[PDB]
Nucleic acid binder design. Structure first.
Lengths: 37, 173, 122, 215
RNA sequence: ACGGGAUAAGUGCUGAAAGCAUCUAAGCAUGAAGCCCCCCUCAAGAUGAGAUUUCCCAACUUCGGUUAUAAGAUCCCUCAA
RNA sequence: UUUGGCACCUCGAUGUCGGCUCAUCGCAUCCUGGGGCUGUAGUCGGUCCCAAGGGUUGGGCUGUUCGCCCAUUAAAGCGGUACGCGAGCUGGGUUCAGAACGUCGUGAGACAGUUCGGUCCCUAUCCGUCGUGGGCGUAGGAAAUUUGAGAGGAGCUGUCC
RNA sequence: UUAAGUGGAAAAGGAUGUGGCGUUGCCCAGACAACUAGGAUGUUGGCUUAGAAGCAGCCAUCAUUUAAAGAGUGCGUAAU
């Protein structure tokens, strides 16, 4: 996981979603995994 | 609800027993009772369960699709049921039946014992592939995830528990 | 009952005669050691020649304390002085000749070489 | 389950298997009887009430607690029994296994049973912080005028007060304390005594409550 | 250093909004020395003052007030766990 | 929590630093616990997230706060509470009278740069705290046994097979 | 209007979570997902670079079996 106030997509597959009031990004690879905080 | 517009939901050889706040379904493998929702409404014309959403609100628009999918799942699992399959890739990693319960050996200092549940049937193919037949899609998925969580796939070699068609990115460490 | 700063005679032929103890090891806050326990120590008086030289920092095992030991049968054993033997960080001694008597509680700590080399074991 | 009462007699030692030495407390558990059976439908909780040491019957112009009073006599009359010094309740037992008037015999306990033992601590009186708590004493030389007092009790203007639980002097002594997981060594039915491994709280000829451990 | 529940991070199942996908919106699980309970002690001045068992009850007398007095305490005295 | 800026309370007095005794809070986590990612093969390690329950050593040279070192430890955390705590203790430091070195000054003397020496008061009224009693209350009076709304305590960790 | 107890503590920046106002384009000759059905070849042709034939890095980036595809969008890639 990669926590940071600035979440952005790195690759095209890396989409953006919300869960429990927090912004996250989901990619096939987990290195692009992020959440906002 | 584009899926709620496909809410014909014709049962083949199965009854559909509404009871107001909840609904029961009975077929070949009956007894599927669920307290679905009240904001939605239902109807049975002859052999078609049609669901309707009021007020065209956001919440109703979501709940329409959710309830329709749940109802279709319930009737389809009462009719045909569901089956979830997986396999143990490993060396010395072996599972087997114990009547109703399952037993597994993965190289711990103690084997693992899976206690079965209702409307659930395990099936060992060749002590390396396993199937779980049931009627509740959520239940079979839950149990499959539970058993695979015991020893998930290892990345460097692939040792662990994995589905029949799951991919595992293997790192050459 | 060996604490920091106690002085012990040495009961082997390693080269040291008198030794001062620096630390009782084990846990944090360990204050006192007794028979079978390991200490680190300094040699304050050495014999000419010998393997170990004055000013060296070494490890030792305690044998024959004065405030001796109780046993499960309710028996006790005591001695008239405090003594130690210097070891090779494998429960083996640096010398080859143990002097004086030795307690029987050394068998429980895997000091069989010292027990074998010793005279009367009590 | 399996509770009884007794008096502490003293400490001795005994020899076990392979010659091992065992310090032992001897407890006189004598003439225990059941006086009452409390229930959930009446009293709100299931328990038996046990009386241990017999005293004298009622007497006119009696001044001491050696002689029962009319209430105690009537209470010990329902059960066909005599009046008793000490009365205590047990909630850990099965209430149906006992009967009013029944005699609780020491042979309820057998060797190897792990037990809890309850009693009042001895008694010491007004004691300071060095003894009542484990406080360190100040220097006895180098110009010191601070030996056995307690140190500071608070900080400063911020919190211009003393908090509760500050560990000052006061009375130390008799408070009830249980010790857990002692075991029975043997039982002598002719003298009606139990031998407990270890030591129990309280002075000699003092009441102790023995019962079975949970763990 | 146990064990029960509910939870955090996190892993999930089912599943729409958005014919797909999605751990979440509705729902079902798991999940920590942390929270609550379990363990020990104090505790009805808990003015909300609780409950059980047993004992006692006036001769007048609105048995109020009375001398009485009962159950029960105390004064006093010998003592200490 | 620093060095400062301002000069709002206190100059008919608000005790200065270290150390001892005694604690209490926060988390921006030293150990233990749970997890994600890894340029994580295992052993490990690095980074990030959750988390404050408990625990968090003894000595040498230091006035020393600070710092270096010796041996341990699962770890030797960072801070606040009048840089916590002198009507609880020392008084090593600084600074008062004495004296001396160096420097400066015509000099009396100064530096704050060094050095030896150099008096630490108080019978607790109120709040507060630790214990321990008397009075009254609780729809009759008493002896005994109790429930438990609440409150406090406890909570650590290692090596070996 | 808001669904956070915001209300009842700030910022650079980051995101969808909803309302409003316009402009503009997408379509029964069926839009926007998603199924599968085609993935090319003379051709890496050339400098042909560790060979590389979507990839040391500069391309030369031409017809098109075809209702319809590129001297390969793109997964890639030791190269495939």
């Amino acid at each position: 996981m990669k926590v940071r106030p600035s979440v952005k997509p790195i690759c095209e597959k890396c989409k953006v979603i919300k869960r429990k009031g927090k912004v996250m990004v989901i990619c096939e690879n987990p290195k692009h995994k992020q959440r906002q905080g | 609800s584009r899926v709620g517009k496909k809410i014909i939901d014709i049962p083949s050889d199965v009854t559909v027993t509404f009871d107001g706040n909840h609904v029961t379904v009975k077929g070949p493998k009956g007894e599927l009772s669920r307290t679905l929702n009240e904001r939605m409404t239902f109807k049975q014309e002859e052999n078609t369960i049609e669901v309707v959403r009021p007020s065209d609100s956001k919440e109703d628009r979501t709940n329409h699709g959710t309830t329709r999918a749940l109802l279709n799942n319930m009737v389809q699992g009462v009719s045909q049921g569901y089956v979830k399959v997986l396999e143990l890739v490993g060396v010395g990693y072996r599972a087997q039946m114990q009547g109703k319960d399952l037993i597994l050996n993965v190289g711990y200092s103690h084997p693992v014992e899976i206690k079965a549940e209702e409307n659930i049937t395990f099936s060992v193919e060749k002590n390396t592939v396993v199937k779980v037949e049931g009627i509740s899609k959520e239940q079979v998925g839950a149990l499959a995830s539970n058993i695979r969580s015991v020893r998930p796939p290892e990345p460097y070699k692939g040792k662990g528990i994995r589905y029949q068609g799951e991919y595992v990115r293997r790192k050459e460490g | 009952m060996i604490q920091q700063e106690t002085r012990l005679k040495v009961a082997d032929n390693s080269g040291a005669r008198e030794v001062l103890t620096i630390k009782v090891l084990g846990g944090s806050g360990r204050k006192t050691a007794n028979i079978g326990d390991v200490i680190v120590c300094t040699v304050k008086n050495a014999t000419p020649g010998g393997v170990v030289k004055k000013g060296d920092v070494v490890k030792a095992v305690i044998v024959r304390t004065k405030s001796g030991v109780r046993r499960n049968d309710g028996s006790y054993i005591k001695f008239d002085e405090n003594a130690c033997v210097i070891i090779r960080d494998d429960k083996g001694p640096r010398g080859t000749r143990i002097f004086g008597p030795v307690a029987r509680e050394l068998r429980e700590g895997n000091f069989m070489k010292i027990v074998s080399l010793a005279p009367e074991v009590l | 389950t399996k509770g009884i009462l007794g008096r502490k007699i003293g400490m001795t030692q005994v020899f076990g298997e392979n010659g091992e030495l065992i310090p032992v407390t001897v407890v006189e558990a004598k003439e225990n009887v059941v006086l009452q059976k409390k229930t959930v439908e009446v009293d709100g909780y299931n328990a038996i009430q046990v009386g241990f040491e017999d005293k004298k019957a009622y007497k006119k112009d009696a001044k001491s607690n050696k002689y029962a009073n009319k209430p105690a006599e009537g209470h010990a009359k329902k059960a066909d029994a005599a009046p008793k010094r000490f009365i205590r309740e047990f909630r850990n037992v099965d209430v149906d296994a006992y009967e009013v008037g029944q005699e609780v015999s020491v042979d309820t306990f057998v060797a190897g049973d792990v037990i809890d033992v309850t009693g009042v601590s001895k008694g010491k009186g007004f004691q300071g912080a060095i003894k009542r708590h484990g406080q360190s004493r100040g220097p006895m030389s180098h110009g010191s005028h601070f030996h056995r007092a307690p140190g500071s009790v608070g900080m400063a203007s911020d919190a211009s007060r003393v908090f509760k639980g500050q560990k000052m002097p006061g009375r130390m002594g008799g408070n009830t304390v249980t010790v857990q997981n002692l075991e029975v060594v043997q039982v002598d039915t002719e003298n009606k005594v139990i031998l407990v491994k270890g030591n129990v709280p309280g002075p000699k000829k003092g009441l102790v409550e023995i019962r079975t451990s949970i763990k």
